[PDB]
From a paper:
The MSOX series at 170 K, reported here, at atomic resolution is comparable with those determined at other temperatures, reproducing key mechanistic features including the orientation of nitrite and its bidentate mode of binding, changes to occupancy of the gatekeeper and proximal rotamer conformations of AspCAT and the formation of an NO intermediate, demonstrating the presence of side-on NO in crystals of CuNiR during an in situ turnover. In dataset 1 (Ds1), clear electron density is apparent for a nitrite molecule bound to the catalytic type 2 Cu site in a highly asymmetric bidentate orientation with Cu–O2 and Cu–O1 (nitrite) bonds 1.88(3) and 2.51 Å, respectively with an occupancy of 0.75 nitrite. The Cu–N (nitrite) distance was 2.42(6) Å.
Copper nitrite reductases (CuNiRs) found in fungi, bacteria and archaea belong to a highly conserved enzyme family that catalyze the one-electron reduction of nitrite to NO [NO2− + e− + 2H+ ⇆ NO + H2O]. The involvement of CuNiRs in two branches of the global nitrogen cycle, denitrification and nitrification, make them of critical environmental importance since N2O is a major by-product of denitrification, which is the third most significant greenhouse gas with a global warming potential 300 times that of CO2.3 The catalytic type 2 Cu centre (T2Cu) of CuNiR is located at the interface of two adjacent monomers and linked to the electron-donating T1Cu centre via a Cys–His bridge. Two invariant active site pocket residues AspCAT and HisCAT are involved in substrate-binding and catalysis and a conserved IleCAT residue provides steric control of ligand binding to the T2Cu. We have undertaken crystallographic studies at a higher temperature of 170 K (normal temperature for synchrotron X-ray data collection is 100 K) at atomic resolution (<1.20 Å) confirming the formation of a side on nitrosyl intermediate during catalysis in crystals and show by DFT calculations that the stability of the {CuNO}10 side-on form is governed by the protonation state of the histidine ligands in the catalytic pocket.
Residue numbers in the entry:
A (entry chain A), B (entry chain A), C (entry chain A): 7 to 339
The structure:
């Protein structure tokens, strides 16, 4: 096919956990879907203590933004590495086929840009991440990862082939950080990336994250940034982990339909309490809220959730159903 | 519905790995199934060395007892925290919907009780655990967790829709403990829970259990407490892990039908050697014994099994089948 | 049945990642398939630094060789422990039923041999490993493990029941090693196995591998030992991990059909980016190559891959498809 005969549509990305507007069921034939991302190296405070790291981001956030296309669209990414950055970067899409997912074709030094195109031949949610040869885990675990959703052209289906339509979608990126520590246990600090590299490697080799966070920091998805829904709304939560296993759980709810390893040609698992998303994968869970109130959304290694940071909240509006749950006798002497 | 028009049935719980009597296929319409549990803080010796911890239990055991109901029954739990305990506790059921699984409605100080009711709308095995705000992993990893089984009203089914009926059922709760260590590696000790809390947190944050045990102690499911079966018997083993991944394996057997993430509306996985139960989940495996003798039932991280405690035994009675396995030439020079 | 009336076929094993010749669809009725393995304790250099360990092998390799039979064949293994070895060994097949998978019947001291027969009643890929009572994880994590493939008699099938036929097969054994370290972090060394045992146990109990490798060493499946394919070829990659979870990923490709927990009566998962093989399991992934070039095949904990050793390469010959992927604008200022 002459790709130049296809429609082009430019997407304007949004910061996680929000997701750019899209159609679940494709309203057009295949398209070339145009995205641009600008790499930003920046300092980020990641915990309540004020611990500050040198993050490596796509488009200024950890995680990078969720990209959404349909199966057999073409993804055309302009990747910009401004001269205000100091490292070489690239991008690997797990959705793509060939050239290490794109990494072999997208190496950009500061002051360079590149444009990659690939055909999104398989439906699912997929990780994307930076992957410069010899320095891969350092870039990934500095926050340089996100996800892409490739919807089936006729949207999502349940285990019986009937439609599933979400009302809202959120993208939760989970990030394991490995902040080097001195022998006494305090975080070290470093003056340039090259002076940091050996201690970064040492810290990674412990296989013990110092922080595990959603949307780039402890508490990022709480308070005025809690996720929201109403009773009766259908919500899809896309969750990715580019480097390490996680086990998401909606405290007070379920995954009514879960693609734990993220690939929509497979039937979803029903009624999950918790599911395993392997490191290097994106998963997706569909839930219809039935009760109002505060929910916690966590990695259900509860240490990882409540001591290391892998916990967010939903605030859900609506009516309470006492048939589904009630306090018969409130706590009393 | 007026729940007061429904039958009430009081269950009398039993200590794991045994399971209270129940019917696989529901012999009545929906019921309110009444349970009572009394929280007990107690010292427990967990290994052969004599290491003693301050455990936090439901009904005196680690794990707490298995509760069994059918889909769309109501679970009505009276939870008692006697004044001989010193901490605040609550309960979260992963089977339930709303109020963080019940935790937001069941906070009981010593000397208090409460009664919670919820509708068991989804079939499967599910974790329950204590979850007091700000102290969640400490209570869970002190042993304060168990499981609940919500059977389909017409019992279990295989991947083709035909019945699966177990002859025996056992509940294996697997517990990761994080016993604080001094720099030399010996377990520390503490005089009150509040004096222990910071070191407990420190120990948890290593993400490295000091002990991983079945039924509350190294060797608990061995010797005179080994699990038992006969050749030809159909056995369901429910396995839960409230905080950390495990990978069960019957040494010498298989999981003929496994719901690794525990939810019975999904078809089981067939012929598993090993399966992954994510932390925060209950799973269930169905096996028909074909050979007599000693079996080991383990977490198949064999370090976790044989060095940290996650190993039990079956003793199986009956005839040996030499067609299925035989020593053709016994070991010899 | 009188097994003595069945055909006997002797297999001549090959060193991983290659696999002995076999038929996907069975060309005969059930057979007794005869294998012989000779245990070899040997020194192995496992990393680029020259770190040398005392490995425990089946047939001289880590992993041991892949054995291939069909469902309801009998596997008859002659296991030889020459008098040039110093330890007791045995074998457990996860494919087998009874006697701890064979371990209770195959204990051989140096200078002894034994012959075990079992019926391969369940199709799938399965782990085999040494398992001497009281010393199990030490033998396994010294490299004493491999896998066996039990093919359905009519070969592999997709999720719809139509045939899947591979053109090439490779066996990737992934090994976690626990090389004891001194307080400063250097690997220790030891003069006999018994003098090594306590420090080996200590090192294992950290649950933190020092090395995680494919085919027995860092870089073993790279360079002149890279895996190979051509565009359009259908490749099955069998992957095992006898002790610890892994999450394989073909960088630049997919698992088109994956049996993550290895058992062929289940439908495969489609279009996987990454899958979880639990410790104690073998899995298998089927892929049809669509692009030429270098691929990396990794455990997608990228620390485990690129810093600890769990990475190999494919070199794929053929035509580049610019419709599937192209650089629209190569990197430039
Ligand atoms: O289910 N909450 O930990
Ligand atoms: O890959 N499906 O969950
Ligand atoms: O299969 N037993 O380790
Ligand atoms: O959730 N089913 O295994
Ligand atoms: O997808 N490669 O890390
Ligand atoms: O066990 N089947 O992937
Ligand atoms: Cu980068
Ligand atoms: Cu990747
Ligand atoms: Cu408690
Ligand atoms: Cu929970
Ligand atoms: Cu051995
Ligand atoms: Cu085993």
């Amino acid at each position: 096919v002459d790709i130049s005969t296809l429609p082009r549509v430019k997407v304007d990305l949004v910061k996680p956990p929000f997701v750019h507007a899209h159609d679940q069921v494709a309203k057009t034939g295949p398209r070339v879907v145009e995205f641009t991302m600008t790499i930003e190296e920046k300092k980020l405070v990641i915990d309540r203590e004020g611990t500050e790291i040198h993050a490596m981001t796509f488009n200024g956030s950890v995680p990078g933004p969720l990209m959404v296309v349909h199966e057999n669209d073409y993804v055309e990414l302009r990747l910009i590495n401004p001269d205000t950055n100091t490292l070489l970067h690239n991008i690997d899409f797990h959705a793509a086929t060939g050239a290490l997912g794109g990494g072999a074709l997208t190496q950009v030094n500061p002051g360079e840009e590149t444009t990659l195109r690939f055909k999104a031949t398989k439906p699912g949610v997929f990780v994307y991440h930076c992957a410069p040869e010899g320095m891969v885990p350092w870039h990934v675990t500095s926050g340089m990862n996100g996800a892409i959703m490739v919807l089936p052209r006729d949207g999502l289906k349940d285990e019986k082939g009937q439609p599933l339509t979400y009302d809202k979608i959120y993208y939760v990126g989970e990030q394991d950080f490995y902040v080097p520590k001195d022998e006494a246990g305090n975080y070290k600090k470093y003056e340039t990336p090259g002076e940091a590299y050996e201690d970064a490697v040492k810290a990674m080799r412990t296989l013990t994250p110092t922080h595990i966070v959603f949307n780039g920091a402890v508490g990022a998805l709480t308070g005025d940034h809690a996720l929201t829904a109403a009773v009766g709304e259908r919500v899809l939560v896309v969750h990715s982990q580019a480097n390490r296993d996680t086990r998401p759980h909606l405290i007070g709810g379920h995954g009514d339909y879960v693609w734990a390893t993220g690939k929509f040609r497979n039937p979803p698992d029903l009624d999950q309490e918790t599911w395993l998303i392997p490191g290097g994968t994106a998963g997706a869970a569909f839930y219809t809220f039935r009760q109002p109130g505060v929910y916690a959304y966590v990695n259900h290694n509860l240490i990882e959730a409540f001591e290391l940071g892998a916990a967010g909240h939903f605030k859900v509006t609506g009516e309470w159903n006492d048939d589904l749950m009630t306090s018969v006798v409130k706590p009393a002497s």
